[PDB]
Amino acid sequence: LYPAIPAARRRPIRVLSLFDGIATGYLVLKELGIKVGKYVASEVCEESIAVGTVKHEGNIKYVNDVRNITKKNIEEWGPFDLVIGGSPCNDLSNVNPARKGLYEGTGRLFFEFYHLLNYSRPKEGDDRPFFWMFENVVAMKVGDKRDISRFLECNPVMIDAIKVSAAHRARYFWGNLPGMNRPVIASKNDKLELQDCLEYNRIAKLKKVQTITTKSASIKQGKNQLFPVVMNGKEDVLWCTELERIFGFPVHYTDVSNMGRGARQKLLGRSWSVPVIRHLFAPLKDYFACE
Amino acid sequence: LYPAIPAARRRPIRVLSLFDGIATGYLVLKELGIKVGKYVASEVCEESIAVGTVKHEGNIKYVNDVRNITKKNIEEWGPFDLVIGGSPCNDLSNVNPARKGLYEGTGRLFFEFYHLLNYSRPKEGDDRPFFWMFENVVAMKVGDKRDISRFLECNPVMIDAIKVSAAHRARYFWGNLPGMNRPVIASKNDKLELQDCLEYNRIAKLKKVQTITTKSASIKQGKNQLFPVVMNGKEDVLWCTELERIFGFPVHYTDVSNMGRGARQKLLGRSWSVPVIRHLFAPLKDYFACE
Amino acid sequence: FETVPVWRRQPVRVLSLFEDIKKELTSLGFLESGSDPGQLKHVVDVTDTVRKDVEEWGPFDLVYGATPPLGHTCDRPPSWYLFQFHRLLQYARPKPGSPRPFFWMFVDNLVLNKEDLDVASRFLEMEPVTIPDVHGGSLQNAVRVWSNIPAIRSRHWALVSEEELSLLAQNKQPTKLVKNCFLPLREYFKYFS
Amino acid sequence: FETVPVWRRQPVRVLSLFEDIKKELTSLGFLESGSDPGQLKHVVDVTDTVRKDVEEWGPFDLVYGATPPLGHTCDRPPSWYLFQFHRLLQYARPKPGSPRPFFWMFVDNLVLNKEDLDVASRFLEMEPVTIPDVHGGSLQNAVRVWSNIPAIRSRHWALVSEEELSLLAQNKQPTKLVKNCFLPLREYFKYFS
DNA sequence: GCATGTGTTCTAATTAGAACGCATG
DNA sequence: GCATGTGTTCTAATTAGAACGCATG
Ligand SMILES: Nc1ncnc2c1ncn2[C@@H]1O[C@H](CSCC[C@H](N)C(=O)O)[C@@H](O)[C@H]1O
Ligand SMILES: Nc1ncnc2c1ncn2[C@@H]1O[C@H](CSCC[C@H](N)C(=O)O)[C@@H](O)[C@H]1O
């Protein structure tokens, strides 16, 4: 573990987020009260960047596509106290029968995280604190999970969002964060049941919903694919504001860029369960300034 | 000509809203601070009702299509202290070349407001206060404006939303509200310039935008139909949250019912300029309970 | 409306709109022959008549409305005649305390469509009554009547086939029809003959 | 990396991955004895090799990476060899303090596509050099080399076009080239003969 | 003097939805 | 012991945009 840091010696956190998505990392960090000195986000989706900048008013330095981040970039933008990211899982998750592993297609982008991580690592003789974390799906080939752990020299911790959210989301988490293996516990404001996430005059058919993907079909529950919501005595699909509350995002977090339903679900389906990331970053507020 | 009412004698307001749309009236009244005792809304658009119910958590009694409201209904639901409504203008506004006028198509729905207004009027010998207001477009055949004034036995005051908003919206207002002809004055919280309504990292090309209709073409400004927003050095159209701010509605007021861009502009296109309605309802605070 | 003894039945003060029935009322014996000059007021274009105009014209015992007979004389939209009739009708109602019997009737010469007819009944608070005015060997005249005259809604007129009456209008492409529905008013007002 | 006096040049300690270079290296005088456990360590499959392995396998002076010679002979994706090579390479670099010269090289037998090529140069922090072995009557054998050997990226090679290289690969469907590539190595370690 | 507008429409892009997929608790 | 899944694809519904319109300050 790292040595505790006297409060006064603590400085703001400098975060390098690769594949930032909709800036979930920055969100949890700010909701935790941690002073964010610098948040360098590597993201290529126009709408994703739009949400991050608009919802956080330009505090995120968007660099670009991760493969064009150089060694000099890491030292100019650095130093970094936290390096986080989750690579695209379209070629790793078992939901796609045509996945291409992590050595072809988009799975390769994992090694960019591995590459930029070692660049960000403090050189020998620099005992300053440094934390990193990598997220990805559980439904990946055992060979891929093996190799990933090989390159990161660490074994993942599986955390299912069901304990703190109203949805199924089982994900592996590599990293060195303090107390990742600790038992996860629910909070007061954690929306644990679908009815807590719905709008007024809507009834929830289930306590929990199945793992949410980019596609609207994952909103229909079970083998029958029934609608999860009833309102006005008519069956209906989830709403975008409700999807956001399921993931723990602020309501209307993805009301940006004139995005419709497919767009907002696409961004939310690939994101992190906010409460899970909060559980992971929680012990960080003992190493950095808070305000 | 309204008898002043001491505060203790004041009781909450009972409002009959016909063609309620997205419950602008209720929004204005509640923002003013008036106790809304009862708000009976006659509306047939599902998404419109979805906004009113969800955004106001079921305080609005929806009845239905106005043509099925009976004299008995007006007596049971009553008494009403305020009767407000704006008839559809698709067959009255000059923008539609194939409009059918006040006596055919949709224009005849005006007379329903006239009909129910007389049902709601206090009977002879009932000195109790009673206010009403009717809104519609300025671009209307003189014969229609004439006949409307004839049936309502009142002459309309035209108020253009530009004085208090960032958009051209000139509308006639028949009614008996206290001080409708008074000078329209801006507030310190009125967003008078388009730049005030835009999101972060968005530049407004214009100080004011033209009258916003249901179709997305009214966002392209001027004869050259230029885009009104520059973002990251690129032309872009207004956003739903920006249209909402232009009108004075709370941001995300129409992030409802999985509605997209076209749907949300369609509801906002025929809505009222909130600050205008606020200027009209303001003197009601001196006739009904407030809290 | 209770009955009024014969010796208290004043002459009618009729307001006639869109159509003049001075000949019909004089024939049936409600209108004096000597010029009042007018115990019956007639207006054709009401787009600019205000409440204080009807009030100024003296109390009215009956308000008559009528669509234009079948033809191309339909200058204005059909619904205009009803909305305008309803508009002036409210102007003519006396104070809530009813000193005398107030009657109204609105006649359509098979001009309004069903979409127009339901608005008519909704605004007149009554379903219309159809006048067959058709002998066994003749079915010429036919009209619809909304009216609060008790006799006009009380007894049984000759039932008709709606498809048939619509067919009579397409084929077309007065006393028995309406004047027969006017006689019951004699009970309430003075009879001149 | 400065030059080493001939009398302090100790024997080289090399780590060979995916390909056994014992024959090529010994031919140029880099291994002293028929049995040289310390001189060269060879691993063909690294999927389960950890840093503690390389650390304990004794410090290394050279780390050689090579792709399978051009043929339908490898089930593994071409990028796998580079990613794994880069993974262990970071394991083999000694502490930041430089006790002796540390070298590394990675050769591709025309197996990596342009996508794999750009990822390769990005991860190895340099654009590759091309090793052609052509005597006019033949232009068949060639390989790409990423290496920090100063002489491997200082001398001028027979610069040949990419389409020409693509043609050579389509036509294919070391002794001279790789040895010339390696000669600058024995200016740093013991010459065994 | 000429740009403006609480819209309908017809067509070209565009989206939603289901078929597809199978190793694994 | 079946149900499940940070997804791609192909089609069938839809959605967006421009032509249309002209009395009027
Ligand atoms: N080459 C690249 N460089 C940087 N980002 C990329 C990239 N290719 C894909 N991405 C982005 O990486 C993201 C991975 S999905 C993960 C999103 C993020 N973890 C969240 O919480 O929302 C996607 O949004 C995708 O747009
Ligand atoms: N027959 C009918 N009965 C009740 N409402 C109707 C109706 N026909 C149309 N409407 C509704 O009347 C509204 C007129 S547009 C006016 C909306 C409202 N003034 C606002 O501020 O938003 C439309 O939303 C339309 O859906």
Side-chain angles (χ1 to χ4, degrees), chain A residues 5 7 10 13 29 31-35 131 178 278 280-284 286-290:
Chain A
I5 297 195
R10 301 174 184 174
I13 193 179
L29 279 172
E31 284 187 356
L32 278 177
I34 296 180
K35 255 218 212 176
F131 306 97
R278 170 144 189 166
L280 289 175
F281 293 178
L284 290 182
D286 289 324
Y287 298 82
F288 304 97
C290 294

PDB file of all heavy atoms in Angstrom, chain A residues 5 7 10 13 29 31-35 131 178 278 280-290, unseen atoms left out:
ATOM      1  N   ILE A   5      -1.086  10.215   3.526  1.00  0.00           N
ATOM      2  CA  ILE A   5      -0.529  11.528   3.233  1.00  0.00           C
ATOM      3  C   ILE A   5      -1.118  12.535   4.217  1.00  0.00           C
ATOM      4  O   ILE A   5      -2.343  12.640   4.331  1.00  0.00           O
ATOM      5  CB  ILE A   5      -0.792  11.957   1.779  1.00  0.00           C
ATOM      6  CG1 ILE A   5      -0.101  11.003   0.794  1.00  0.00           C
ATOM      7  CG2 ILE A   5      -0.296  13.369   1.530  1.00  0.00           C
ATOM      8  CD1 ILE A   5       0.012  11.536  -0.654  1.00  0.00           C
ATOM      9  N   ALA A   7      -2.830  15.765   5.528  1.00  0.00           N
ATOM     10  CA  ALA A   7      -3.829  16.512   4.771  1.00  0.00           C
ATOM     11  C   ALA A   7      -3.208  17.699   4.046  1.00  0.00           C
ATOM     12  O   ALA A   7      -3.487  17.936   2.865  1.00  0.00           O
ATOM     13  CB  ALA A   7      -4.951  16.977   5.698  1.00  0.00           C
ATOM     14  N   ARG A  10      -1.338  17.172   0.779  1.00  0.00           N
ATOM     15  CA  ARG A  10      -2.122  16.707  -0.355  1.00  0.00           C
ATOM     16  C   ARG A  10      -2.318  17.824  -1.373  1.00  0.00           C
ATOM     17  O   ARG A  10      -2.608  18.969  -1.018  1.00  0.00           O
ATOM     18  CB  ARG A  10      -3.482  16.192   0.117  1.00  0.00           C
ATOM     19  CG  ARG A  10      -3.408  15.050   1.114  1.00  0.00           C
ATOM     20  CD  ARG A  10      -4.788  14.695   1.642  1.00  0.00           C
ATOM     21  NE  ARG A  10      -4.731  13.657   2.667  1.00  0.00           N
ATOM     22  CZ  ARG A  10      -5.781  13.246   3.370  1.00  0.00           C
ATOM     23  NH1 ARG A  10      -6.974  13.786   3.158  1.00  0.00           N
ATOM     24  NH2 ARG A  10      -5.640  12.296   4.285  1.00  0.00           N
ATOM     25  N   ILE A  13      -5.619  16.169  -7.721  1.00  0.00           N
ATOM     26  CA  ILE A  13      -5.337  14.953  -8.474  1.00  0.00           C
ATOM     27  C   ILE A  13      -5.223  15.298  -9.951  1.00  0.00           C
ATOM     28  O   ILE A  13      -6.001  16.100 -10.481  1.00  0.00           O
ATOM     29  CB  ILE A  13      -6.429  13.893  -8.230  1.00  0.00           C
ATOM     30  CG1 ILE A  13      -5.979  12.527  -8.753  1.00  0.00           C
ATOM     31  CG2 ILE A  13      -7.733  14.311  -8.889  1.00  0.00           C
ATOM     32  CD1 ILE A  13      -6.987  11.421  -8.517  1.00  0.00           C
ATOM     33  N   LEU A  29     -15.224  11.529  -9.499  1.00  0.00           N
ATOM     34  CA  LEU A  29     -14.207  12.283  -8.774  1.00  0.00           C
ATOM     35  C   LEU A  29     -14.783  13.570  -8.196  1.00  0.00           C
ATOM     36  O   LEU A  29     -14.557  13.893  -7.024  1.00  0.00           O
ATOM     37  CB  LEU A  29     -13.023  12.582  -9.693  1.00  0.00           C
ATOM     38  CG  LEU A  29     -12.020  11.442  -9.867  1.00  0.00           C
ATOM     39  CD1 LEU A  29     -11.004  11.777 -10.944  1.00  0.00           C
ATOM     40  CD2 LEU A  29     -11.325  11.150  -8.546  1.00  0.00           C
ATOM     41  N   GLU A  31     -18.041  14.294  -7.720  1.00  0.00           N
ATOM     42  CA  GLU A  31     -19.063  13.939  -6.741  1.00  0.00           C
ATOM     43  C   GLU A  31     -18.458  13.446  -5.434  1.00  0.00           C
ATOM     44  O   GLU A  31     -19.137  13.471  -4.401  1.00  0.00           O
ATOM     45  CB  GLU A  31     -20.003  12.876  -7.312  1.00  0.00           C
ATOM     46  CG  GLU A  31     -21.018  13.408  -8.312  1.00  0.00           C
ATOM     47  CD  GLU A  31     -22.027  12.355  -8.730  1.00  0.00           C
ATOM     48  OE1 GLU A  31     -21.891  11.193  -8.293  1.00  0.00           O
ATOM     49  OE2 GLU A  31     -22.959  12.689  -9.492  1.00  0.00           O
ATOM     50  N   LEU A  32     -17.203  12.996  -5.452  1.00  0.00           N
ATOM     51  CA  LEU A  32     -16.525  12.575  -4.234  1.00  0.00           C
ATOM     52  C   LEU A  32     -15.923  13.737  -3.457  1.00  0.00           C
ATOM     53  O   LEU A  32     -15.467  13.533  -2.326  1.00  0.00           O
ATOM     54  CB  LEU A  32     -15.424  11.562  -4.563  1.00  0.00           C
ATOM     55  CG  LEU A  32     -15.857  10.108  -4.756  1.00  0.00           C
ATOM     56  CD1 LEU A  32     -14.668   9.248  -5.153  1.00  0.00           C
ATOM     57  CD2 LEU A  32     -16.506   9.572  -3.488  1.00  0.00           C
ATOM     58  N   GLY A  33     -15.909  14.939  -4.027  1.00  0.00           N
ATOM     59  CA  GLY A  33     -15.323  16.091  -3.378  1.00  0.00           C
ATOM     60  C   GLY A  33     -13.844  16.284  -3.627  1.00  0.00           C
ATOM     61  O   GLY A  33     -13.247  17.194  -3.038  1.00  0.00           O
ATOM     62  N   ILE A  34     -13.234  15.462  -4.475  1.00  0.00           N
ATOM     63  CA  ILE A  34     -11.801  15.545  -4.731  1.00  0.00           C
ATOM     64  C   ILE A  34     -11.526  16.687  -5.701  1.00  0.00           C
ATOM     65  O   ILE A  34     -12.185  16.809  -6.741  1.00  0.00           O
ATOM     66  CB  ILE A  34     -11.271  14.212  -5.283  1.00  0.00           C
ATOM     67  CG1 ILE A  34     -11.431  13.102  -4.244  1.00  0.00           C
ATOM     68  CG2 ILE A  34      -9.816  14.348  -5.705  1.00  0.00           C
ATOM     69  CD1 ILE A  34     -10.932  11.755  -4.716  1.00  0.00           C
ATOM     70  N   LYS A  35     -10.554  17.529  -5.360  1.00  0.00           N
ATOM     71  CA  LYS A  35     -10.117  18.584  -6.266  1.00  0.00           C
ATOM     72  C   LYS A  35      -9.439  17.962  -7.482  1.00  0.00           C
ATOM     73  O   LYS A  35      -8.466  17.216  -7.343  1.00  0.00           O
ATOM     74  CB  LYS A  35      -9.159  19.536  -5.555  1.00  0.00           C
ATOM     75  CG  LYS A  35      -9.751  20.883  -5.185  1.00  0.00           C
ATOM     76  CD  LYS A  35      -8.708  21.973  -5.376  1.00  0.00           C
ATOM     77  CE  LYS A  35      -8.883  23.109  -4.384  1.00  0.00           C
ATOM     78  NZ  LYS A  35      -7.790  24.112  -4.522  1.00  0.00           N
ATOM     79  N   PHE A 131      -1.822   5.826  -8.971  1.00  0.00           N
ATOM     80  CA  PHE A 131      -2.903   4.857  -9.030  1.00  0.00           C
ATOM     81  C   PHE A 131      -3.405   4.717 -10.459  1.00  0.00           C
ATOM     82  O   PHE A 131      -3.414   5.683 -11.232  1.00  0.00           O
ATOM     83  CB  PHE A 131      -4.059   5.263  -8.110  1.00  0.00           C
ATOM     84  CG  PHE A 131      -3.639   5.520  -6.694  1.00  0.00           C
ATOM     85  CD1 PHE A 131      -3.396   6.810  -6.254  1.00  0.00           C
ATOM     86  CD2 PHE A 131      -3.486   4.473  -5.802  1.00  0.00           C
ATOM     87  CE1 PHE A 131      -3.009   7.051  -4.950  1.00  0.00           C
ATOM     88  CE2 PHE A 131      -3.099   4.706  -4.497  1.00  0.00           C
ATOM     89  CZ  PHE A 131      -2.861   5.996  -4.070  1.00  0.00           C
ATOM     90  N   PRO A 178      -6.580   1.559  -3.595  1.00  0.00           N
ATOM     91  CA  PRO A 178      -6.663   1.040  -2.225  1.00  0.00           C
ATOM     92  C   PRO A 178      -7.990   0.338  -1.983  1.00  0.00           C
ATOM     93  O   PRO A 178      -9.061   0.896  -2.225  1.00  0.00           O
ATOM     94  CB  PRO A 178      -6.517   2.296  -1.359  1.00  0.00           C
ATOM     95  CG  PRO A 178      -5.854   3.299  -2.237  1.00  0.00           C
ATOM     96  CD  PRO A 178      -6.349   3.012  -3.624  1.00  0.00           C
ATOM     97  N   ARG A 278     -17.592   4.922  -8.021  1.00  0.00           N
ATOM     98  CA  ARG A 278     -17.470   5.622  -6.747  1.00  0.00           C
ATOM     99  C   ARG A 278     -16.893   4.706  -5.676  1.00  0.00           C
ATOM    100  O   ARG A 278     -16.027   5.118  -4.896  1.00  0.00           O
ATOM    101  CB  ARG A 278     -18.830   6.168  -6.311  1.00  0.00           C
ATOM    102  CG  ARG A 278     -18.838   6.695  -4.886  1.00  0.00           C
ATOM    103  CD  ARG A 278     -19.723   7.920  -4.743  1.00  0.00           C
ATOM    104  NE  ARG A 278     -19.566   8.545  -3.433  1.00  0.00           N
ATOM    105  CZ  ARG A 278     -20.000   9.764  -3.130  1.00  0.00           C
ATOM    106  NH1 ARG A 278     -20.618  10.496  -4.045  1.00  0.00           N
ATOM    107  NH2 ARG A 278     -19.811  10.253  -1.912  1.00  0.00           N
ATOM    108  N   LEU A 280     -14.865   2.399  -6.177  1.00  0.00           N
ATOM    109  CA  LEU A 280     -13.463   2.148  -6.490  1.00  0.00           C
ATOM    110  C   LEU A 280     -12.589   3.361  -6.191  1.00  0.00           C
ATOM    111  O   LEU A 280     -11.474   3.211  -5.677  1.00  0.00           O
ATOM    112  CB  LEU A 280     -13.322   1.729  -7.953  1.00  0.00           C
ATOM    113  CG  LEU A 280     -13.856   0.336  -8.291  1.00  0.00           C
ATOM    114  CD1 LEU A 280     -13.777   0.079  -9.785  1.00  0.00           C
ATOM    115  CD2 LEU A 280     -13.086  -0.727  -7.523  1.00  0.00           C
ATOM    116  N   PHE A 281     -13.070   4.564  -6.503  1.00  0.00           N
ATOM    117  CA  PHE A 281     -12.286   5.772  -6.270  1.00  0.00           C
ATOM    118  C   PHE A 281     -12.414   6.304  -4.849  1.00  0.00           C
ATOM    119  O   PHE A 281     -11.672   7.222  -4.484  1.00  0.00           O
ATOM    120  CB  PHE A 281     -12.698   6.876  -7.249  1.00  0.00           C
ATOM    121  CG  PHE A 281     -12.360   6.584  -8.683  1.00  0.00           C
ATOM    122  CD1 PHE A 281     -12.708   7.480  -9.679  1.00  0.00           C
ATOM    123  CD2 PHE A 281     -11.691   5.424  -9.039  1.00  0.00           C
ATOM    124  CE1 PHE A 281     -12.402   7.227 -10.999  1.00  0.00           C
ATOM    125  CE2 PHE A 281     -11.384   5.163 -10.361  1.00  0.00           C
ATOM    126  CZ  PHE A 281     -11.739   6.067 -11.342  1.00  0.00           C
ATOM    127  N   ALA A 282     -13.327   5.758  -4.047  1.00  0.00           N
ATOM    128  CA  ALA A 282     -13.569   6.278  -2.702  1.00  0.00           C
ATOM    129  C   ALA A 282     -12.296   6.466  -1.887  1.00  0.00           C
ATOM    130  O   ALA A 282     -12.098   7.561  -1.340  1.00  0.00           O
ATOM    131  CB  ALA A 282     -14.549   5.351  -1.971  1.00  0.00           C
ATOM    132  N   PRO A 283     -11.411   5.472  -1.760  1.00  0.00           N
ATOM    133  CA  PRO A 283     -10.206   5.656  -0.936  1.00  0.00           C
ATOM    134  C   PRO A 283      -9.211   6.658  -1.501  1.00  0.00           C
ATOM    135  O   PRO A 283      -8.177   6.897  -0.867  1.00  0.00           O
ATOM    136  CB  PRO A 283      -9.600   4.246  -0.892  1.00  0.00           C
ATOM    137  CG  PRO A 283     -10.094   3.592  -2.137  1.00  0.00           C
ATOM    138  CD  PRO A 283     -11.480   4.125  -2.349  1.00  0.00           C
ATOM    139  N   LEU A 284      -9.482   7.252  -2.666  1.00  0.00           N
ATOM    140  CA  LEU A 284      -8.542   8.210  -3.238  1.00  0.00           C
ATOM    141  C   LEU A 284      -8.578   9.546  -2.509  1.00  0.00           C
ATOM    142  O   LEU A 284      -7.575  10.269  -2.497  1.00  0.00           O
ATOM    143  CB  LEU A 284      -8.833   8.412  -4.725  1.00  0.00           C
ATOM    144  CG  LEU A 284      -8.521   7.231  -5.644  1.00  0.00           C
ATOM    145  CD1 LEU A 284      -8.802   7.596  -7.092  1.00  0.00           C
ATOM    146  CD2 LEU A 284      -7.077   6.777  -5.471  1.00  0.00           C
ATOM    147  N   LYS A 285      -9.710   9.892  -1.895  1.00  0.00           N
ATOM    148  CA  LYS A 285      -9.824  11.170  -1.203  1.00  0.00           C
ATOM    149  C   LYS A 285      -8.961  11.249   0.050  1.00  0.00           C
ATOM    150  O   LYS A 285      -8.996  12.275   0.740  1.00  0.00           O
ATOM    151  CB  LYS A 285     -11.290  11.446  -0.855  1.00  0.00           C
ATOM    152  CG  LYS A 285     -11.967  10.354  -0.047  1.00  0.00           C
ATOM    153  CD  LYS A 285     -13.478  10.431  -0.194  1.00  0.00           C
ATOM    154  CE  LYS A 285     -13.984  11.850   0.017  1.00  0.00           C
ATOM    155  N   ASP A 286      -8.196  10.205   0.361  1.00  0.00           N
ATOM    156  CA  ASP A 286      -7.215  10.238   1.435  1.00  0.00           C
ATOM    157  C   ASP A 286      -5.811  10.548   0.935  1.00  0.00           C
ATOM    158  O   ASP A 286      -4.886  10.654   1.746  1.00  0.00           O
ATOM    159  CB  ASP A 286      -7.209   8.903   2.192  1.00  0.00           C
ATOM    160  CG  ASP A 286      -8.460   8.698   3.026  1.00  0.00           C
ATOM    161  OD1 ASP A 286      -8.975   9.691   3.583  1.00  0.00           O
ATOM    162  OD2 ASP A 286      -8.925   7.544   3.126  1.00  0.00           O
ATOM    163  N   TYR A 287      -5.631  10.697  -0.377  1.00  0.00           N
ATOM    164  CA  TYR A 287      -4.327  10.966  -0.963  1.00  0.00           C
ATOM    165  C   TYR A 287      -4.268  12.278  -1.733  1.00  0.00           C
ATOM    166  O   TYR A 287      -3.189  12.650  -2.208  1.00  0.00           O
ATOM    167  CB  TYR A 287      -3.913   9.819  -1.896  1.00  0.00           C
ATOM    168  CG  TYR A 287      -3.753   8.480  -1.208  1.00  0.00           C
ATOM    169  CD1 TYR A 287      -4.854   7.676  -0.947  1.00  0.00           C
ATOM    170  CD2 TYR A 287      -2.500   8.016  -0.830  1.00  0.00           C
ATOM    171  CE1 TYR A 287      -4.713   6.450  -0.321  1.00  0.00           C
ATOM    172  CE2 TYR A 287      -2.348   6.792  -0.206  1.00  0.00           C
ATOM    173  CZ  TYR A 287      -3.457   6.013   0.046  1.00  0.00           C
ATOM    174  OH  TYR A 287      -3.311   4.794   0.667  1.00  0.00           O
ATOM    175  N   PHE A 288      -5.386  12.989  -1.876  1.00  0.00           N
ATOM    176  CA  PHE A 288      -5.425  14.197  -2.685  1.00  0.00           C
ATOM    177  C   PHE A 288      -6.337  15.226  -2.031  1.00  0.00           C
ATOM    178  O   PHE A 288      -7.173  14.901  -1.185  1.00  0.00           O
ATOM    179  CB  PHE A 288      -5.892  13.895  -4.115  1.00  0.00           C
ATOM    180  CG  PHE A 288      -5.061  12.857  -4.815  1.00  0.00           C
ATOM    181  CD1 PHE A 288      -5.464  11.532  -4.847  1.00  0.00           C
ATOM    182  CD2 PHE A 288      -3.872  13.204  -5.434  1.00  0.00           C
ATOM    183  CE1 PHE A 288      -4.700  10.575  -5.488  1.00  0.00           C
ATOM    184  CE2 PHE A 288      -3.104  12.251  -6.077  1.00  0.00           C
ATOM    185  CZ  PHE A 288      -3.518  10.935  -6.103  1.00  0.00           C
ATOM    186  N   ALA A 289      -6.162  16.481  -2.441  1.00  0.00           N
ATOM    187  CA  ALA A 289      -6.936  17.576  -1.875  1.00  0.00           C
ATOM    188  C   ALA A 289      -8.426  17.370  -2.122  1.00  0.00           C
ATOM    189  O   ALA A 289      -8.837  16.749  -3.107  1.00  0.00           O
ATOM    190  CB  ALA A 289      -6.483  18.910  -2.471  1.00  0.00           C
ATOM    191  N   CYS A 290      -9.241  17.908  -1.216  1.00  0.00           N
ATOM    192  CA  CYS A 290     -10.688  17.715  -1.251  1.00  0.00           C
ATOM    193  C   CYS A 290     -11.381  19.050  -1.026  1.00  0.00           C
ATOM    194  O   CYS A 290     -11.203  19.676   0.025  1.00  0.00           O
ATOM    195  CB  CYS A 290     -11.135  16.698  -0.198  1.00  0.00           C
ATOM    196  SG  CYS A 290     -10.557  15.012  -0.492  1.00  0.00           S
TER     197      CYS A 290
END
